[PDB]
A and B are shown apart, each in its own frame.
Chain A
Amino acid sequence: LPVIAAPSMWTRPQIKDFKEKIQQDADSVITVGRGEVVTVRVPTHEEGSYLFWEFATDNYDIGFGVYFEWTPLLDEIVPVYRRDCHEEVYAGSHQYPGRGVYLLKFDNSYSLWRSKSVYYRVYYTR
């Protein structure tokens, strides 16, 4: 049965340069609302081998995780937990297990009063 590769995750403090570079596009910023969970669907590129991602927030932490959708069959890649991505930039990677759709979960379901501003980029490698 198909085996899933373990993901990798990193952090870097160059958070201001990141955001400032992101804000130069509108389609790269998300405003997760109070009690809301936003799922970003990222299809595997036909000529790609790895997924790569970056993300950060302003002022507050947020829940982050990753799933892989087959094509409704799901594989848990990165378990959902709160990350201090308001202090640093979280990057990560995962080898494509096949053709499908990655589900990047930005989970703010636990927040009663705080909305979360999310800057993010998703990629693929040849």
Chain B
Amino acid sequence: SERTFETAPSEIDADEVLEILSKSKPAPTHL
């Protein structure tokens, strides 16, 4: 079973990025 649809990306500010990443720690990308 499969599905697909499109979603427009919203603009993210610098302070938005900082707000998120200030709480976050690195995670594995490629395992």
Interface residues of A (CB under 8 A from B): 6-14, 27, 33, 35-43, 45, 48, 51-52, 54, 78-79, 81, 89-92, 121-126
Across the interface, name the chain A residue whose C-beta is closest to B17: A52
Residues in A with CB closer than 8 Å to B30 are 78-79
Instruction: List which B1-31 residues lie within 8 A (CB) of chain A.
Output: 1-12, 16-17, 20-21, 23-31
Min CB distance A1 to B, Å, is 21
Verify A36–B12 contact, CB threshold 8 A. Answer: no
Distance (whole angstroms) from the CB of A24 to the closest CB of chain B: 14
Establish whether residues A37 and B24, one from each chain, have CB atoms under 8 Å apart when the complex forms. no
The 7 closest A-B pairs by CB, nearest first: A10-B24, A123-B12, A12-B24, A36-B1, A41-B6, A124-B9, A12-B23
> Is B5 in contact with A41, judged by CB distance below 8 angstroms?
yes
> What 17 new A-B contacts, CB under 8 Å, besides A39-B4, A122-B10?
A6-B29, A9-B26, A10-B27, A12-B24, A12-B25, A36-B2, A36-B3, A37-B3, A41-B4, A45-B9, A51-B9, A52-B12, A89-B24, A122-B7, A122-B9, A123-B12, A124-B11
